[PDB]
Design a protein around this ligand. Structure first.
Ligand SMILES: O=C(O)CNC(=O)C(=O)O
Ligand SMILES: O=C(O)CNC(=O)C(=O)O
Ligand SMILES: [Mn+2]
Ligand SMILES: [Mn+2]
Lengths: 312, 312
């Protein structure tokens, strides 16, 4: 082994022996603020809390209710042919990281498209705090103070509050965010696959030309490459593995990853700590809200940047 | 120019330098809540000094005379060196050794007598190993350890050691690190710490030195005796640099270190987080007590083990 390979081996053997990030802790009761800070926030350690929330949104938010309550408002929706907004797709021999087609439409039309299992895949996943900016009325059916047990660790209000409503075919491919994430399913369920950041060396990442989905004259989807004004492809680094069906022959390093699986039901809270890898699937027409808080930087981020350099 | 390992260490250090990780000892004027301590200091591996935090009876009462009277002029373990560097590097006959102190037992009144001799050998009650709870139990009555609950609730375990320190100004503790969270309480005088964060390991030169112990001859003159396993000469890894006057020509990598200086007065508390390098000096006949808690292994330990592998 190289000296870098020897060092990465040491990291992984130590983390394995000490069970770092080796499970998703399951709680049936909301912990105290101190508990959360000590056992989950400070260890960068995920946790799922079952039936933690009894917000009126839970049990009342349906497509019909939302159409009524919002007056069939026009909302931002992402559309893909293949179900992978912000995900890899191939065209004419080339693999692209592809951004969704984004458009505006009335909620009733979104619901109609969600009821077509062979049509294009629709997903209200704009995030960018779309709930507080675009759907503020929904806030009245939530109680954010119920998240104080976690927010005390972040010691600031959410930097974003997001609303998600999607087709079962809409899959969020694996990525990491520079946020603490408190994830609250409202209706249906979400299936998460999670990988700890210290396993970066087991997760293959490529550099892909970036494209965006567009529709042709005939309504057919294609990928429009993004180029800069110099004619160069705009590149995006992206996780290359499919956690649902990994090709261990192409990516043997992934064999050493220990992906964690967790289903999150209505009323459950998942704490997804900063820089954790996650891939997300959903039940059909699943509804969820989530709260992003900017991370607080310490040495772990610098070690992560070192890990990136070592695997480059 | 640079190896792969050296490029990776450079990225680590550049990211830590831009974020100023561990760039200052935090100054508080009052004891934080447990949640605050866990969020701002424990979880960040971040040193903090709390000014005039403690009013323990000891701070008023512990003089040499009171200590003699209270311990019945007990015979105590005391460490003696000629140069003031117990557990520190010294040269003899052209060879550089890491030297352990001459350890002996003598009555406290005699120790104090020898502290008052500015030209005599350097004495230091530095046994650690929880010498206060073990060898000087009565002194506990002048303490209020409950006042440290703000920190202990974050370590969520009782102290693993309680140590008592009383030293000559000449007695200096050379730079080292400990696998313990350290809550350090100055009772009389002041301590001067030089602190270096663990992610700067590659900036701190470390060597392998033959191990020796101080002894005195029939004539009273000090010398170093090599230590041998009951076998070969024994060796120890030790920090090579003198942070008070570093030889940057011999150790240019130390120029990239960013040491912190903090003075801890009577009544003050210093949180010295696990694995931080520290060098410690004291006012004359300084008295201190500290508490060690075994560390909880997290990802930072795994990263640090990897860093040790890369720095060898
Ligand atoms: O809900 C999804 O499909 C994906 N969500 C996220 O990546 C997130 O909350 O960070
Ligand atoms: O006080 C001293 O001289 C040295 N103390 C320590 O190294 C410590 O408390 O861990
Ligand atoms: Mn995400
Ligand atoms: Mn120490």
């Amino acid at each position: 082994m190289s000296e870098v390979e020897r060092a990465l081996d040491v990291l992984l053997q130590e983390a394995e022996e000490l069970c770092i990030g080796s499970s998703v802790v399951e709680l049936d009761r909301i912990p105290t603020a101190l508990e959360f800070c000590r056992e989950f926030y400070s260890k960068n350690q995920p946790v799922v809390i079952r039936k933690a929330l009894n917000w009126p949104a839970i049990g009342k938010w349906t497509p019909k209710y939302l159409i009524e309550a919002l007056g069939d408002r026009s909302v931002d929706v992402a559309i893909t042919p293949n179900g992978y907004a912000d995900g890899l797709a191939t065209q004419n021999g080339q693999e692209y990281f592809v951004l969704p087609l984004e458009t505006k439409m009335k909620l009733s039309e979104v619901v109609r498209r969600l009821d077509d299992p062979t049509g294009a895949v629709h997903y209200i996943q704009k995030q960018n705090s779309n709930l507080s900016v675009d759907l503020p009325e929904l806030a009245a059916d939530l109680r954010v103070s119920d998240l104080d047990f976690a927010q005390q660790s972040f010691n600031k209000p959410p930097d974003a509050v997001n609303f998600w409503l999607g087709d079962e075919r809409a899959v969020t491919s694996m990525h990491k965010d520079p946020y603490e994430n408190v994830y609250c399913v409202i209706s249906g369920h979400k299936d998460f696959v999670l990988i700890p950041p210290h396993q970066l060396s087991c997760v293959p990442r490529g550099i892909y030309p970036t494209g965006v989905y567009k529709t042709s004259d005939s309504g057919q989807f294609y990928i429009e490459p993004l180029r800069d004004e110099e004619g160069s492809d705009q590149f995006t680094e992206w996780v290359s593995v499919d956690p649902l069906s990994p090709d261990l022959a192409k990516y043997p390093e992934y064999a050493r990853a220990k992906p964690l699986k967790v289903r999150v039901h209505a009323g459950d809270i998942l704490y997804l700590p900063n820089y954790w890898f996650h891939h997300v699937s959903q039940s059909h027409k699943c509804i969820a809200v989530n709260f992003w808080y900017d991370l607080d930087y310490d040495s772990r981020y610098c070690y992560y940047r070192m890990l990136e350099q070592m695997t480059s």
